[PDB]
Design a protein around this nucleic acid. Structure first.
Lengths: 142, 176, 38, 209
RNA sequence: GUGAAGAGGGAAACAACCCAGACCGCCAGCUAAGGUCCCAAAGUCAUGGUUAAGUGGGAAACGAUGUGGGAAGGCCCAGAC
RNA sequence: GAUGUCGGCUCAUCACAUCCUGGGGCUGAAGUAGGUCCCAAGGGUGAUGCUGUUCGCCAUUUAAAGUGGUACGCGAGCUGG
RNA sequence: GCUGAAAGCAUCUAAGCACGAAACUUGCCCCGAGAUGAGUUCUCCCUGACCCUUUAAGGGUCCUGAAGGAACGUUGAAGAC
């Protein structure tokens, strides 16, 4: 016999909704990533995406400990010689509430085409209203 | 701590209102309120307030002492308020109050007009005097500091806006 | 303001205070006793 | 506030009685016809879409023709949008004329500059030419060095080089309004504006003032 | 001693460091150095402390009421600070 | 079994131990001026006589004529004193 | 700087409340949904059959070809092409 492998055309994916208010950023992000990758399923197979669709609400209310709210810096480079640009956690929340959770989860996911496909299943929202009522998400507590 | 041990005496005519952490004081001078820190136990008693630390909070005594001081200032606030006296020193330095605005002539090329906050009223006995009245100690101190900052007392003649009870300690340039 | 690695009291009126993680000497009698450790 | 769409007619002078010559650009501003009003509820922002001039009925496609017919206006030579401030409102089919600028006295004129084609670095970026003599070998107008050495190992992005010059949208700010002539559909602004004669110009009240 | 003339695991990568020398095959198990939130396998482990700087996760003489302890002192309820 | 040297030229980019402009404390800071230290890279920071010269010294400017890194930046860009 | 304990006092800091520079982020200008995360509004146009099977988001046949676009030509203060 050969070890069972998941088939991309027959995997079962479910929808969940998560409220991010008050949650620690990293401790929420790890759980989000492990469910996006599908590591909670008995059918987990490294080369196929078996994770679920997760909806995150109230991304602007996510919490961090210590002085991270003013001291965590987000660097990126534009590609030009001046280039280096930075933003603190507070600035990111004021401008992009969703971006912080998105990039934390992205940093916790495998790199490569499959990892990007996995990240595609994450729907992050600043408010507590989403447009995906038709997919009937289940309430998931993290 | 041992500042916080001494309870504050609630006199007649003033009442207290507590919702766990946010507190309210009402008296003849008016309305004062704040939210105390999460580590201090506000506890009204027979016409007194007693303050103590909570549990699981390090440095709860320091916060208790701060809360005791603030509430003491509130009680002294809603009754007879607070007063700050400012003096103007220097030739041509004048002050005048126009309703809710203080007009200062401090030797600039432009007029200086200061807008008072909600609870503060000003009154100029002379042009070299500014008397401030209000219930909030912090606000009146802030307003006095803001007025002082326009022309700080320089150390060669003491010219500028000073608190009435202030020492300037002038000095001479080199000699002669 | 004196910026030094070694800040000390210089007279009886000078006092050590730590403001925002910085050791400072503030002195009520002599203005040139002000010091910050940097 | 909104602006209007005109066309660059040419450039002349105005003589003032006190013996001053003012170089002016003559901008013909016909009636601008509002063809669509965009609002926050439907389009997510507030703006009006205007048309001006005329177009040959054979050159207007039934998509464009139907869009014009909905507004009930005649076909123009194009469509432009102006972002609306909080105060003003307009209605579809309304026509706006040049006396909008009756009391403005500074405008911002936007147009497409004249196309210079593929231009060298001396013309495009004001690079200095090298020696004309003294042994110079085939290198009188070339750019010279373009990078450092192994340590960068590459040419930095955004380096100034030869390429297309002109034929791009350019705005000139804070132009004096010299005359508004409603009956002639003329606006006269002090100075030069981008673009060749007969090209479209967008005139707006000065944003910086 | 190791490389030379040695593989493999670890050390982010990294002849010569650590554990440990590869007869061949197995979709068997068990361990060493290193690990057990996630990338990336396995503790979001139990119990007590200790640090708040991101120490951890780069630096000295030299400074400082930053805190967790210990052993000794002086003063003092007539009354210390 | 080849990594062209110096200077100039054309073109640069970055660091901050900031020359100028900006903020501030101390003065043995009256003002005019400064001195010294702290913060701060947004922009700007001479063209000439001699010398192959970098430099230097001049003679006049300027708001100021910064200092270093970049194969002492740059010869499949140029010159070659 | 203000109020303010620890550490009867004090103390810009610990709770809390203010300020403050050509830096920063905007505001001025340009590009920009391959922004694969490819978005938005208005408008225009096509609503005939038949057959064969593996049956599937299947393939042909005949009639039909619309909105539009291209080609070609007269050309351009557009442009190497």
């Amino acid at each position: 016999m050969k070890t069972f492998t998941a088939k991309p055309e027959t995997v079962k994916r479910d929808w969940y909704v998560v409220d991010a208010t008050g949650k620690t950023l990293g401790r929420l992000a790890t759980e989000l990533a492990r469910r996006l990758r599908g590591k909670h399923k008995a059918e987990y197979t490294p080369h196929v995406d078996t994770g679920d669709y997760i909806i995150v609400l109230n991304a602007d209310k996510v919490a961090v400990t210590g002085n991270k709210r003013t001291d965590k810096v987000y660097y990126h480079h534009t590609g030009h010689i001046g280039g280096i640009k930075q933003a603190t956690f507070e600035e990111m929340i004021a401008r992009r509430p969703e971006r912080v959770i998105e990039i934390a989860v992205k940093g916790m996911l495998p790199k490569g085409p499959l990892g990007r496909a996995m990240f595609r299943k994450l729907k992050v929202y600043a408010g507590n209203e989403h447009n995906h009522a038709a997919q009937q998400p289940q309430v998931l507590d993290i | 701590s041992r500042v916080a041990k001494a309870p504050v005496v609630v006199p007649a005519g003033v009442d207290v209102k507590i919702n766990g952490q946010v507190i309210t004081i009402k008296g003849k001078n008016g309305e004062l309120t704040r939210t105390l820190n999460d580590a201090v136990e506000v506890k009204h008693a027979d016409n007194t307030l007693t303050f103590g630390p909570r549990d699981g909070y390090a440095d709860g005594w320091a916060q208790a002492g701060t809360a005791r001081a603030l509430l003491n200032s509130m009680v002294i606030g809603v009754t007879e308020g607070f007063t700050k006296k400012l003096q103007l020193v220097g030739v041509g330095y004048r002050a005048a109050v126009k309703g809710n605005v203080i007009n200062l002539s401090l030797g600039f090329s432009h007029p200086v007009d200061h807008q008072l906050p909600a609870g503060i009223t000003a009154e100029c006995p002379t042009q070299t005097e500014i008397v401030l009245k209000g219930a909030d100690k912090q606000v009146i101190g802030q307003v006095a500091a803001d007025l002082r900052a326009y022309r700080r007392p320089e150390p060669y003649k003491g010219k500028g806006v000073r608190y009435a009870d202030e020492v300037v300690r002038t000095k001479e340039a080199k000699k002669k | 303001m004196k910026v030094r690695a070694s800040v000390k009291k210089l007279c009886r009126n000078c006092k050590i205070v730590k403001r925002d993680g910085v050791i400072r000497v503030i002195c009520s009698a002599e203005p040139k006793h002000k010091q910050r450790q940097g | 506030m909104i602006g209007l769409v005109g066309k660059k007619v040419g450039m002349t002078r105005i003589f003032t009685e006190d013996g001053v010559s003012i170089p002016v650009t003559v901008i013909e501003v016909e009636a601008n016809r509002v063809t669509q009003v965009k609002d926050l509820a439907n389009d997510g922002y507030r703006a009006i879409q205007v048309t001006t001039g005329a177009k040959k009925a054979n050159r207007v496609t039934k998509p464009e023709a139907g869009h014009f017919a909905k507004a009930g206006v005649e076909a123009g030579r194009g469509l432009w949008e102006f972002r609306l401030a909080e105060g003003e409102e307009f209605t579809v089919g309304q026509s706006i004329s040049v006396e909008l600028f009756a009391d403005v006295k500074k405008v911002d004129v936007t147009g497409t500059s004249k196309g210079k084609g593929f231009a060298g670095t001396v013309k495009r970026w004001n690079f200095r030419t090298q020696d004309a003599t003294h042994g110079n070998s085939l290198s009188h107008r070339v750019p010279g060095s373009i990078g450092q050495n192994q340590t960068p190992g590459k040419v930095f992005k955004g380096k100034k080089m030869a390429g297309q010059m002109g034929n791009e949208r350019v705005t000139v700010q804070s132009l004096d309004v010299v005359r508004v002539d409603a009956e002639r559909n003329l606006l006269l602004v002090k100075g030069a504006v981008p673009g060749a004669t007969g090209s479209d110009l967008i005139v707006k009240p000065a944003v910086k003032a």
